[PDB]
């Protein structure tokens, strides 16, 4: 499988490592998918470019 998670920019490289693990583990056990077949990427979005209800996170 393949996961693209869109996140706002306020996370450290350690949190990001812990999240790729968590997401990979979730797919392994909701679906019986092998881990080595799961590619996870984080698409980090600046808060001025992430919109929720017409309003930026930055606002």
């Amino acid at each position: 499988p393949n996961i693209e998670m869109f996140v706002v920019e306020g996370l450290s490289d350690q949190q990001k490592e812990k999240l790729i693990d968590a997401l990979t583990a979730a797919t392994v056990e909701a679906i019986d998918a092998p881990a080595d077949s799961i590619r996870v990427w984080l698409s980090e979005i600046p808060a001025k470019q992430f919109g929720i209800a017409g309003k930026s996170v930055a606002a």
Binding site: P1, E4, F6, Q15, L19, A22, L23
Partner: protein, 62 residues
């Protein structure tokens, strides 16, 4: 806040909901955001339209 899954078709409808909840609970566990702003988008791709090493998933047993 938004999780997009690209994966080969054929998984049960109940596997699909097991995934949606499992991935939400990963983000809420690990980042600590509120499940409310979590969106999980599942993209079934048919085995004739998903390729590995230049070969369709179908010719690969998939």
């Amino acid at each position: 806040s938004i999780i997009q899954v690209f994966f080969i078709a054929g998984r049960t409808d109940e596997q699909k909901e097991r995934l949606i909840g499992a991935l939400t609970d990963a983000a809420v566990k690990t980042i600590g955001i509120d499940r409310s702003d979590v969106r999980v988008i599942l993209k079934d791709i048919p085995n004739t339209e998903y390729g590995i090493a230049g070969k369709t998933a179908k010719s690969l047993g998939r």
